[PDB]
């Protein structure tokens, strides 16, 4: 409203530069976050396959203790695993 085209151009250029630099920052940083989420997703898929269907012997991969089975549950933007594990108890000395 307040300026002529030649006079307006410099201000418009500075506004454009600042705004698009902000967009660049938003894009790249978001993409980094996407990379982390992708890696987590691959971990989750490996967990699902190796744990819910089968009886993987990979220790401590499916929580503390020997891994018996697991049950999955959905959650907003996530998954929750319940692990059922077998743990020893009161013990005794012996000579062998």
């Amino acid at each position: 409203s307040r300026l002529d085209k030649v006079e307006a151009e410099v201000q418009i250029d500075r506004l454009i530069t600042g705004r698009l630099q902000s967009l660049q920052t938003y894009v790249t940083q978001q993409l980094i976050r996407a990379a982390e989420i992708r890696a987590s997703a691959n971990l989750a898929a490996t967990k699902m396959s190796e744990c819910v269907l089968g009886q993987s012997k990979r220790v401590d991969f499916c929580g503390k203790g020997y891994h018996l089975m697991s049950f999955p549950q959905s959650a907003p933007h996530g998954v929750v695993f319940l692990h059922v594990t077998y743990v020893p108890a009161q013990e005794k000395n012996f000579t062998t």
């Binding site: 989420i37 997703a41 989750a44 503390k64 018996l68 996530g78 998954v79 059922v84 108890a89």
Partner: peptide, 12 residues
């Protein structure tokens, strides 16, 4: 022996 239930959470 005893049985323990553990909970793990993962974003998708």
């Amino acid at each position: 022996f005893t049985i323990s239930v553990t909970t793990e959470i993962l974003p998708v």
